[PDB]
Amino acid sequence: SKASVKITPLGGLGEIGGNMMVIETPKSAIVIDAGMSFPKEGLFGVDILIPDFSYLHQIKDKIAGIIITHAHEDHIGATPYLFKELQFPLYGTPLSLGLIGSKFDEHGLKKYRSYFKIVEKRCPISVGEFIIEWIHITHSIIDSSALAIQTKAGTIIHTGDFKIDHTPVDNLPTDLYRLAHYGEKGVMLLLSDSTNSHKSGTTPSESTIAPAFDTLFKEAQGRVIMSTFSSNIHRVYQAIQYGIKYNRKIAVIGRSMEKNLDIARELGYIHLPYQSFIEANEVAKYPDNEVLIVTTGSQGETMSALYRMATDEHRHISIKPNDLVIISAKAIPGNEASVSAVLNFLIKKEAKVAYQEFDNIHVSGHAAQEEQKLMLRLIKPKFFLPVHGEYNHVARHKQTAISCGVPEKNIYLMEDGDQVEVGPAFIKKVGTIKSGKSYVDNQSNLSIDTSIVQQREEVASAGVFAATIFVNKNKQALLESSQFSSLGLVGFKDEKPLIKEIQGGLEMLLKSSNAEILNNPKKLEDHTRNFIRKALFKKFRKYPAIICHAHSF
Amino acid sequence: SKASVKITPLGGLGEIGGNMMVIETPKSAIVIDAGMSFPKEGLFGVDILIPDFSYLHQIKDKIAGIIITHAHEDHIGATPYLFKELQFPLYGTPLSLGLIGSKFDEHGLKKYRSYFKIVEKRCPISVGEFIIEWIHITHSIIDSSALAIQTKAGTIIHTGDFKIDHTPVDNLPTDLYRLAHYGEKGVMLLLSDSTNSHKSGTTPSESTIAPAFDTLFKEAQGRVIMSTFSSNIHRVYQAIQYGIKYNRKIAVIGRSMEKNLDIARELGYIHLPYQSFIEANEVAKYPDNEVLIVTTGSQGETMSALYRMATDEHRHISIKPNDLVIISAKAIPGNEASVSAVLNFLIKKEAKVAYQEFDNIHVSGHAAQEEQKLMLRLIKPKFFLPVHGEYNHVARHKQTAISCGVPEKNIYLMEDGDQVEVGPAFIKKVGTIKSGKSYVDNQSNLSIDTSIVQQREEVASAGVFAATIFVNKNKQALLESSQFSSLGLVGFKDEKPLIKEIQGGLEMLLKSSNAEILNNPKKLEDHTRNFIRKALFKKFRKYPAIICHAHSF
């Protein structure tokens, strides 16, 4: 009857990152964004997670394209890999589409590059039975945008990643007029950031950071090091601008930085004298006070480089006591241990460290309660649904919305995989769809089901002991010396006896075993598993994986 | 010539917890404290670490006893297990000695219980060539103390764990006069807390917490849950006092809580009507608003209970939407992930949660910069050496000491295992001693070298594939069907072929193998390892552990 849509999301509900939405209307289908989720972060790298793709293959014939709301790795990460399975027009932003093409070429998905479809800011883009608009909106990232969707069913808003910086370094303030206009006409659906719903007071503008660089650089007497990730372009821009202001040549380490710099500079978003850029191998040729280094590893890796620098195998840079190191890695909770370790190792090198001002403690990069309320009033929407956060954060954001006078019955909290049917004046849950994650190794760059590592680590608890006994079916006992191996059981020097005790018990059982059980590998494997379970219960209270091999040679 | 001592520490320098010092003088030796170090904390439990004991066995004939500065698990943890190797008089505090005896009986070390030697507060205790005094000093813990050591070489101060609470619930203010008196006579050596050297402003007094319980309990309409660890006696005391003030029966879950309660109540430190205490199984008989539950697991375990309560197998408590849950686990960095997970699962149960006021964010329990400076002025010591913290924290504390006018040349930063010779007016490093950690399983309660799990997890990276081939020395090939097993390699349904491809290559090599290499297991194992290395390099760029077994049946 009345026009309606079916918006069921694939990522973002249950973890920072890995955001991906799929709006499904009658004979209509659009994709909003495809990020990566980073649960942990260690001394050598990060956890690599890409959203499952099973649902996409179900309704392939309907999806009218991919809609990307960032030139940033956290939100386009699966786009390149996704094309190793399916292809769809990529209607995005010129800068956002570029970096995405770099990702795909790295993923070997040039097919999907032809799908590139530049959407103009403040300019609508007719996507099948839908109209799309990219509303500039301030954020850390050099470029960004939000989506306004017009449909015969109404209008839908996806902001997602936005902090309302009154004075951004790029002084390109959000074009609030359009958002207010959409509110004035009447906005059906709203998707808004919910990350920092636990904090109060508006987040500080990046310009609050400028003084930090200025003061630190005036007092710096030696080399300056900077550590971040491949997609914090604004921060590195500020850093290099100050360095040239302080006559420090820039050394860019990590090919991701180099490609981002070249793409942006060619795109003209910034101005940079190429001669001012240097290699790490040339640092020894320059004075310390003229040396500013930029460091990043693979996609998502920042402090693997730092740790190897503290371990001194970087073979391009030697940490010195007169150095000043500025640390800003992706401040996702649970990485404090790695930061502390590297910090201690650096102080052992007698290096001054600056980390207070760039992590989430000062600048989280996502709206606080006041900013969310300001957006909510700007919109005056009928239906509010939080995305890009955990269940608690969306709960708090919904509470804040209640404080703004939004009727409860138009607010829902999603769980990944869910479907929600939304109409002109109706909204309800209809079912769940299968959502999941997949690992990718930064070296191989292939998708691996989580099942393999899951079982690997599940059996990692408790030991793994395998044995092979060459027994004669006519003797019901081992005829040739059995070979045994163990991993995680006990120290070899101290395990030689213990495992060997269970060994004698087992080979005795053979001396008078059951011929049928001995001749049938299944019975031997079951008996070995039972014996291993009993031994592990006696020793450590576990039941380790036991591999048994029977031969009739 | 001049009197001097040799203080080389065994634990505390490099991690929160696991503090243990050994002062070594001519024909003199004393032990200060033996804690446990907790690097991580998960959904099912904690990491279990006990300091190495190798050095103790070297100078056994000199040590005059064990000196314990807490009735608290974080500082006496290795004492019970240590006695499974060596025995020494335990001169401690009556309450501190009790709990320690409980730990030893759990460890089956009753031998060391006879060594129990009660030291009187404000009363000196002659320990061989040394004089010892237990100076009450405020802290979270119901009881505590610091050590004043008089010697012919001078005086040594160990405070260690102390926050200067002006108004503690127990209103037993630190007896500063003695500390000032020792400063007045002239204090040689000072060992002081250094945990929170990164923070400014004095830590809030536990009394700041009272209002929280009062207000929350006035508004509570349902059951109240409380989650902590076995040794936060003061907090549970406040909680139960308020609950009786609000007519809530107390259910103590975790035998550690029950034993601590019985020991303290028998010791008369507190007053408690036994009839007011209840079991969890009886909660269903009482109204929700009369129900307050206390939860703790094994030593160091707090949220394993919480997680099973969210998973609903606690089979004594069912979480309800009207419940109010107060969470205070040992807030060591890196547990935020578990807290977040449990919090989301609880909100899925629609439960109100209170966690802001009890973690390290409000009350870290260890002195801040102002408190350290106040101690430093109270002492006016000649030699300052920070303990109970990481290298960065001790560095910051030493900086603060510099700000207090302490000459640098009397401040050192230790690394675990080091020896430092300290005289009347001399101090220097002399060498290093072997320091290390050992795991203990909370179920078995035995000491395990870290080597076993270290190799277990080192080989956990990459797969583990073993094979056994029954070959004839006269054929240089397998004569009986070879048996293969793999763990972590690939999914069985998808690994059957791949592993089987490498299998055919290998059994072909047999068809025309080297008889001597085939007959000699070493050559077969080397060839199998090389083949596995090549295959893993081709597939995932790894070199997995390969186990080869050769038979001549």
Author numbering:
A (entry chain A), B (entry chain D): 139 to 691
From the study:
RNase J is essential in H. pylori and plays a major role in the degradation of both mRNAs and antisense RNAs8. The central importance of RNase J in post-transcriptional regulation in H. pylori and its participation in an RNase J-based degradosome prompted us to investigate the structure, oligomeric state and post-translational regulation of the H. pylori RNase J. Here, we report the crystal and cryo-EM structures of H. pylori RNase J that assembles in tetramers organized as a dimer-of-dimers.
The enzyme has a preferred orientation in the ice, and this has limited the resolution of the reconstructions to 4.1 angstroms. However, the reconstructions reveal unequivocally a tetrameric quaternary structure and resolve the core as well as the C-terminal oligomerization domain. The N-terminal region, corresponding to residues 1–136, is not resolved in the cryoEM maps. In the dimeric unit, the protomer interfaces are formed by self-complementary interactions made mostly by the CTD. The surface area buried at the CTD–CTD interface is estimated to be 1165 Å2. The beta-CASP and beta-lactamase domains of RNase J also make a self-complementary interface in the principal dimer, with an estimated area of 672 Å2 that is a little more than half of the CTD-CTD contribution. The interfaces that are formed between the dimer units to make the tetramer are also made by the beta-CASP and beta-lactamase interfaces, and these have a total buried area of 2070 Å2.
